[PDB]
Design a protein around this ligand. Structure first.
Ligand SMILES: [Cl-]
Length: 135
């Protein structure tokens, strides 16, 4: 395996999904402390409050409920995740999905015709590999 976090963006997250010709709109990987470790070229203009609120939601599922999930000022409605493990959100023509690993958080952002399950499969396959590697 590779020695750069950026490889997981370029060579997994952003790759065409199951031969559909479609791909995530953007993807990124953040450390637990909230700095960006890897990103795709159209990952949006995130701010620190937003990343912190997501770190909080991994610790305390349900904490985003009154507000929604913001990323680069766009609001996503929270949809069922996996407590402590996966956060998901929906907007009108797309959505977001975020998988926690030991060291990091893997973000995928999608637009139609990509669907919530496709996001989940791409991000969770990577996150499961990373955890197996101690990351
Ligand atoms: Cl960090």
């Amino acid at each position: 395996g590779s020695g750069s976090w950026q490889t997981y963006v370029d060579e997994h997250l952003m790759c065409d999904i199951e031969g559909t010709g479609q791909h995530l709109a953007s993807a990124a990987i953040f450390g637990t402390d909230g700095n960006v470790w890897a990103k795709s070229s159209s990952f949006p203009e995130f701010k620190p409050d937003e990343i912190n609120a997501i770190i909080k939601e991994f610790s305390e599922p349900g904490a985003l409920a009154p507000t929604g999930l913001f990323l680069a000022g766009a609001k996503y409605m929270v949809i069922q995740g996996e407590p402590g493990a996966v956060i998901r959100g929906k907007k009108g023509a797309g959505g977001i999905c975020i998988k926690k690993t030991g060291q990091a958080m893997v973000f995928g952002i999608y637009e139609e015709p990509v669907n919530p399950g496709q996001c989940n499969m791409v991000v969770e396959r990577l996150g499961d590999y990373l955890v197996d590697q101690g990351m």
